[PDB]
Write a protein that binds this ligand. Structure first.
Ligand SMILES: CCCCc1ccc[n+](CC(P(=O)(O)O)P(=O)(O)O)c1
Ligand SMILES: CCCCc1ccc[n+](CC(P(=O)(O)O)P(=O)(O)O)c1
Ligand SMILES: C=C(C)CCOP(=O)(O)OP(=O)(O)O
Ligand SMILES: C=C(C)CCOP(=O)(O)OP(=O)(O)O
Ligand SMILES: [Ca+2]
Ligand SMILES: [Ca+2]
Ligand SMILES: [Ca+2]
Ligand SMILES: [Ca+2]
Ligand SMILES: [Ca+2]
Ligand SMILES: [Ca+2]
Lengths: 362, 362
C-alpha cells in the first residue's frame, strides 16, 4: 500500500515519544517500559490498518487537490499518519476491552491481550485505558501548534462516546430491554422479539460505523485543512452505509469464515448476539425453523452451535447477504457519484476506502 | 458547604443534557436511558465531592479577587461546577474500573457497580468507558465557546494518562519487576524487596495526587482565567504533598477504620498491596516480625489477615502515622505560607482543600 512504509515509520516514532514521555513524567522504570512496549506492539499491530491508512489516503488526496508544495505535503502526510495512529490506538483500546467483555480467545492470530498469562483481565482493563489515553497524547504533542487540534479532539472524543453507546446497545441486546435493571438479573431472551432490523442497525452504526468509517474520513479532511470543501451530510451518509455493511460482513464471517483465516474466534451464536445472521434468519425463516433456532441459539453446546449454522445455511443466509451487498453497492456508488460532482479528489478517497471494504475476506 | 446546593443543581442540568444528547444523537431508548440514569447516579453520587467542590471554591476565590460583574461571576461559578462534575465523573470512571480490578464488594455504602446483579463486570467495564466519555462531553458542550476549552482538555487528559500509569504501578507492585513479562505467569513476591518508600510514593503520587489534588486546583484557575497569576511549580509541589498524604490516610484506613464508617471494604492485606502500612512495617519492624509478615501477607485466610493487623498494632503503625502527619502539616503550612506571600486568594483556596483533608475520618 502506498503509505504503509511511512505509516510504520511513524509508529516507531510515536512509540518512542510515548514511552520516553512516561520516563520523563512518571519515573517509568526499565521493566514497566518494556512491558508497555510489548503491550503497545501486541495491541496496536497485526490488524489491516484500514482506519489509519484511510486518514493518510484522504489527506494525500486533498493535499494534491489543494496543490500543497513539498514542505506542506510532508507536514500533512506526517500529521495524517499521527491521526491514523490515534484511530489505530482507539481501535487497540476497543479490542482489548471487548476481548475481556466477550471472554474471547484469539485476536489477530494471537491470544487476546488479557489472556497472556502475565497479564490477566485485572491488569488488561487498565492497559486498555493506557491505550485510550495515549491516543489523545499524540494529538496534544504533535498538534500542539496546529489550529486543527481543537477539532481533532472534538471529533475523536465524540466518536469515542458514540462507540461506547454502540457497545451499550450490543452488550444489552440479548436481554429484553424492559427487563434491564441494574438491581435485578434477568435471563437472556427466549422469544427474541427485540431481534429486529432496526435494533441491529442501531448497534452496528454506533459501535462500528462512526469510528471505522466516519472518523478516518473526517480526520483526513481536518489534517489537510479541507473539511469545508466537502458535503458534511453526504460524507456522514456514505460513512454510515459502508460502516453498517462492514459490520454485517464481520457478522457473516463470525459464522462462515474459518477462524484461522479470520484471525479470531467469534462466539456470536453461543452468546446469543443480535447479529445480522440472527436478525435476517428470524425475520425470513418459516415458523418451524424459527422454533428450532430458539431451541438451540445462545448455547455453548458445540452441537447446538452447529444446528444454528445448519439453519443459516439451509435458509440461504449467504445468498441473502449477496443480495444485501448488491443493494449496498448501488447506494454507495450513488453517494460517491454525488460527492464526485462536488469534489472529485475526496470522492476518489472514499472509493479507495470502499474498495478495501467491498467483498473483503477478513 | 457553600457551593453544595449550586453544585447539585448543576448535576441535574448536566445529567439532563447528557441523557438528552444520547436521545438526539444515538437513538437512545427509554429503558437504556433509565439504565444510564441509574448508572450515573450510582457511580457519580454518594462520595464527599472534595474534588468537584474544590474547583468551585478555587474559581470563586479567584473570581472575587478580580473585578467582574454579577453576570460574569455567575458564568464562572456555573463553568466551575461543570468542571467539578468533569472530575467527579473521572473519579466515577476510575472507581467503576478499579472496583472490577480489585474484585471489591462495596463502594460508598452500596454494592460496587459491577456487583449489581443486572450489570456484571462484562457490562460495567463499558459503563466506566461511558463515564469517561461523558466527562469530555461536558467540556465540549458547556465550554464550546470558552477560551479555556483547549487547556481544560489538555490538563484533563494529561491527568487521565497520569492516573492510568499510577494504576499500572499499583497493579504490578506485588510482582518483582524483573519478572514482569506478558508471556509468563509469575507468583506474587515472597521477599518484598521492592516495597520501598520510593515505590510507594511513586504509586500514590501518580494514581491519586494528580487527579485528586492537582487537577481540581488547576481547573479552578482555568475556568476563572487566573492560571498565570499563580506559581505553577509551587502549586504542583503542594498538590503532590497533600495528595501523597491523602493516599497514606486511605491506606491507613483500609486496615484500621471500620468498613461501615469508611463505606468500602478494603483488601490491601489480602491482595499484598504496597500500602503505606506495609512499607512502614517492612522498613521499621524487627527481623523476625518482618519474617512473620511475609509468611502471612497476601492471604485471604481470615487468620492470616488477623495476624497482619496485630503485627501492625504491635509495631505502633497508627502512632507512626501521627508522626508522619505532623511532618506533613509542617511542610504544607510552609508551602501555603509561601503561596500566600504570592497570591493570597489562591492560598486561601488551598487552605480550604487542606482543611477537608487534614485529620479526615473517611
Ligand atoms: C466501546 C467498545 C467497542 C468495542 C467494539 C466495537 C466494534 C467491534 N468490536 C469487536 C467485534 P470482534 O470482536 O472484532 O468480532 P464484535 O465483538 O463483533 O463487536 C468491538
Ligand atoms: C486508572 C484507574 C485508577 C484507579 C484508582 C486510583 C486511585 C484510587 N483508587 C481507589 C482506591 P479505593 O478502592 O477507593 O480504596 P485504591 O484501590 O486503594 O487505589 C483507584
Ligand atoms: C469489526 C470490528 C469493528 C472490530 C475489528 O475491526 P477490524 O476487522 O478492522 O480489525 P483489525 O484489522 O484492526 O484487526
Ligand atoms: C482513595 C482514592 C483516591 C479513591 C477514593 O477517593 P475518595 O475517598 O475521595 O472517594 P469519594 O469521596 O469520591 O467516594
Ligand atoms: Ca468481540
Ligand atoms: Ca463484542
Ligand atoms: Ca464480530
Ligand atoms: Ca486498586
Ligand atoms: Ca480499590
Ligand atoms: Ca484504598
Amino acid at each position: 500500500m502506498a503509505h504503509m512504509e511511512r505509516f510504520q515509520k511513524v509508529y516507531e516514532e510515536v512509540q518512542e515519544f510515548l514511552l520516553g514521555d512516561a520516563e520523563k513524567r512518571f519515573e517509568m522504570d526499565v521493566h514497566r517500559k518494556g512491558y508497555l512496549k510489548s503491550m503497545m506492539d501486541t495491541t496496536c499491530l497485526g490488524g489491516k490498518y484500514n482506519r489509519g491508512l484511510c486518514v493518510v489516503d484522504v489527506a494525500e488526496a486533498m493535499a494534491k487537490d489543494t496543490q500543497m508544495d513539498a514542505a506542506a505535503m510532508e507536514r500533512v502526510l506526517h500529521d495524517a499518519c499521527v491521526c491514523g495512529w490515534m484511530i489505530e490506538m482507539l481501535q487497540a483500546h476497543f479490542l482489548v476491552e471487548d476481548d475481556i467483555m466477550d471472554h474471547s480467545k484469539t485476536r489477530r492470530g494471537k491470544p487476546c491481550w488479557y489472556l497472556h498469562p502475565g497479564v490477566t483481565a485485572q491488569v488488561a482493563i487498565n492497559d486498555g485505558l493506557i491505550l485510550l489515553a495515549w491516543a489523545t497524547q499524540m494529538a496534544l504533542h504533535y498538534f500542539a501548534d496546529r489550529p486543527f487540534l481543537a477539532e481533532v479532539l472534538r471529533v475523536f472524543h465524540d466518536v469515542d462516546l458514540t462507540t461506547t453507546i454502540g457497545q451499550l446497545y450490543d452488550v444489552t441486546s440479548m436481554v429484553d430491554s424492559a427487563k434491564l435493571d441494574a438491581k435485578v438479573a434477568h435471563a437472556n431472551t427466549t422469544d427474541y422479539v427485540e431481534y429486529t432490523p432496526f435494533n441491529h442497525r442501531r448497534i452496528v452504526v454506533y459501535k462500528t460505523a462512526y469510528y471505522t468509517y466516519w472518523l478516518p474520513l473526517v480526520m483526513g479532511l481536518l489534517v489537510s485543512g479541507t473539511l469545508e470543501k466537502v458535503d458534511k451530510k453526504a460524507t456522514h451518509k456514505v460513512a454510515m452505509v459502508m460502516g453498517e455493511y462492514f459490520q454485517v460482513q464481520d457478522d457473516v464471517m463470525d459464522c462462515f469464515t474459518p477462524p484461522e483465516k479470520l484471525g479470531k474466534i467469534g462466539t456470536d451464536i453461543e452468546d446469543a448476539k443480535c447479529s445480522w445472521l440472527a436478525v435476517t434468519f428470524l425475520t425470513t425463516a418459516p415458523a418451524e425453523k424459527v422454533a428450532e433456532f430458539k431451541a438451540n441459539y445462545g448455547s455453548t453446546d458445540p452441537a447446538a452451535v452447529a444446528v444454528i449454522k445448519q439453519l443459516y445455511t439451509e435458509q440461504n443466509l449467504l445468498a441473502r447477504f449477496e443480495e444485501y451487498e448488491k443493494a449496498v453497492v448501488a447506494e454507495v456508488e450513488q453517494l460517491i457519484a454525488a460527492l464526485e460532482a462536488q469534489n472529485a479528489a475526496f470522492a476518489a478517497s472514499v472509493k479507495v476506502l470502499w474498495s478495501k471494504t467491498y467483498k473483503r475476506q477478513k
